[PDB]
Amino acid sequence: LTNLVAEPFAKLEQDFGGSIGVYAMDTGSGATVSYRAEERFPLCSSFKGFLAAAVLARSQQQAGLLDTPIRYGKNALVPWSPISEKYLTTGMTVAELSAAAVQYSDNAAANLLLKELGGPAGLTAFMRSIGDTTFRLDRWQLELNSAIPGDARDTSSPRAVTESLQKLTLGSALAAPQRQQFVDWLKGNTTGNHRIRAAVPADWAVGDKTGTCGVYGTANDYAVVWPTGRAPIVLAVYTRAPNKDDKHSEAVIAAAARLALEGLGVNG
Amino acid sequence: LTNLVAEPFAKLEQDFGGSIGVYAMDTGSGATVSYRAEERFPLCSSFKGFLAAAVLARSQQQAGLLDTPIRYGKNALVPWSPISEKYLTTGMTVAELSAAAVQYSDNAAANLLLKELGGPAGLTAFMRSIGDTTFRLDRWQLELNSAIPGDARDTSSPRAVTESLQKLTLGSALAAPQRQQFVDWLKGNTTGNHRIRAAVPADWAVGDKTGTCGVYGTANDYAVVWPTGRAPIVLAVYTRAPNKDDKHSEAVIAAAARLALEGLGVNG
Ligand SMILES: *C(=O)[C@@H](NC(=O)Cc1cccs1)[C@@H]1N=C(C(=O)O)C(=C)CS1
Ligand SMILES: *C(=O)[C@@H](NC(=O)Cc1cccs1)[C@@H]1N=C(C(=O)O)C(=C)CS1
């Protein structure tokens, strides 16, 4: 049921000047679209969705975790911390930091939560616990964005990203209240309007998390999409390019998402 | 007279897993072999040959320059300074530093001479003065070895390297005594036995300068070769590869030199 209908991913990535990786699953039938789906691509900020899921998993064994206040110093603020910088003088709860990391890609919030989980190895351990053997986080922000060609640090594959997203949003990896909170955070993301969402009709529900490394044409997005009247779709689109100064493209991510939905026979 | 005889450079670079750039000139007939010859490749230590030629050019207007003693501190010693480290407590002359830079690829010696010439811009100005509009040096050692894909800093092309080498060793860019000293330094190089020299019969004279960046499979060599009974050949072989951890190959440089000589119809 993989690639029943061929789509012109190769021409798209040639126009882009780099590499595109796509996996998409129709959770009703099991049909899939797959292009470079087992290659490694840099995660960039897309690790933050899985980080919020790990926080939610911990909250199942710590009833008070999400409402715990967290105070931090100015040394915790790194570039692109649009929400956490406004609460420097007050602190924020664990849930508020998780929402900021997911919905505004707040960099400081995600570094604070990563510390709470035991660092890059602690998030990797959570991903192993749900059966993902591909994901690896190795460094902190902003260092994890280097996107060096051939470097496996801070990478995963489109397929493993999609499979783990399905387990966390639609499967049983989280208990039902935590699962719906994860979905709600993804649905409220503000940074993805020009990526997968640009290929999705306005009357369908959709949640996503973006990543943008800033070098090597490297950017990405993953999403759960609920077309009306049929089962949800889960998909991941990752990009990279050979030269450090190559620019990323939001339009290419949107176009690859359109091809994936067309390959699954979903009318849009 | 370019590429009268095709050679399998593409299969060689595919076996290597990267890109190879070759220019070779028969100075008797003007026939040339050219493959990726106008692409930019990192210079790495190959800039040091041109640096020694620039020192020689200056010596034409300063009779005492070559025998001027130079004393330096331990802070001038950078990794891979095998000759200059043995004269830390005594100093070395300008000529001795030039010989060390050319023949042992001594890193500290080349940084001291670059300072004497007014830095990377001063060496670039010398190359412009002999008609080379392609060469650029931008940084000091060891920083100039980063070999980042797409970065034009500290690069030239195989063709421009060969054309400038011809002007300096066989043409009129240097006065006759300085020209022969440059040739003698190149003939005494010790670091190139597994590169162009490995394709050259033992009974032919040959001088060369190597470069090895340490990343991105990036290494190179250029040479003047005097086959007996015919005019000299000038050639340059540069390599790079897409991933930071890709290894360079001396054997590929030797093999590309063999193809270049075969393409020119020189029996070896
Ligand atoms: C995550 O990807 C993170 N990116 C960086 O911190 C590196 C850069 C900083 C400025 C430009 S690139 C944040 N996430 C997003 C995203 O979710 O796409 C960004 C747009 C940049 S900041
Ligand atoms: C020049 O290429 C210079 N290379 C470096 O300093 C970077 C590296 C250090 C250790 C391994 S690579 C010197 N030149 C040569 C050469 O002429 O080929 C080398 C073999 C390394 S040191």
From Swiss-Prot, chains A, B:
Q: Does the keyword Nuclease apply?
A: no
Q: What is the effect of changing residue 79 to R?
A: Increases catalytic efficiency about 40-fold with respect to ceftazidime and reduces catalytic efficiency about 10-fold with respect to nitrocefin
Pfam families in UniProt:
Beta-lactamase2
- Keyword Hydrolase recorded: yes
- Protein residues bound to a beta-lactam: 45, 48, 80, 105, 107, 210, 212
For this chain, one GO molecular function annotation is: beta-lactamase activity
Q: Mind listing the UniProt keywords for this protein, alphabetically?
A: Antibiotic resistance, Hydrolase, Plasmid, Signal
Could you tell me what reaction this enzyme catalyses?
a beta-lactam + H2O = a substituted beta-amino acid
Q: Which InterPro entries match?
A: Beta-lactam/transpept-like, Beta-lactam_cat, Beta-lactam_class-A
**Listed GO biological process terms:** beta-lactam antibiotic catabolic process; response to antibiotic
**Gene3D superfamilies linked:** DD-peptidase/beta-lactamase superfamily
- Per the record, the coiled-coil ranges are none
Regulation of its activity: Not inhibited by EDTA, inhibited by clavulanic acid and tazobactam. Inhibited by cyclic boronates, including vaborbactam and bicyclic analogs of taniborbactam.
What Enzyme Commission number(s) does the record list for this chain? 3.5.2.6
Q: Which residues does UniProt mark as catalytic? A: 45 (nucleophile), 143 (proton acceptor)
Q: What else is on record for this protein? A: Initially two different KPC beta-lactamases were identified from two different Klebsiella (KPC-1 and KPC-2); they were later shown to be identical.
Stated role: Class A beta-lactamase which confers resistance to the beta-lactam antibiotics, including penicillins, cephalosporins and carbapenems. Acts via hydrolysis of the beta-lactam ring. Has penicillin-, cephalosporin- and carbapenem-hydrolyzing activities.
Similarity annotation: Belongs to the class-A beta-lactamase family.
Question: What's the protein called, per UniProt?
Answer: Carbapenem-hydrolyzing beta-lactamase KPC-2
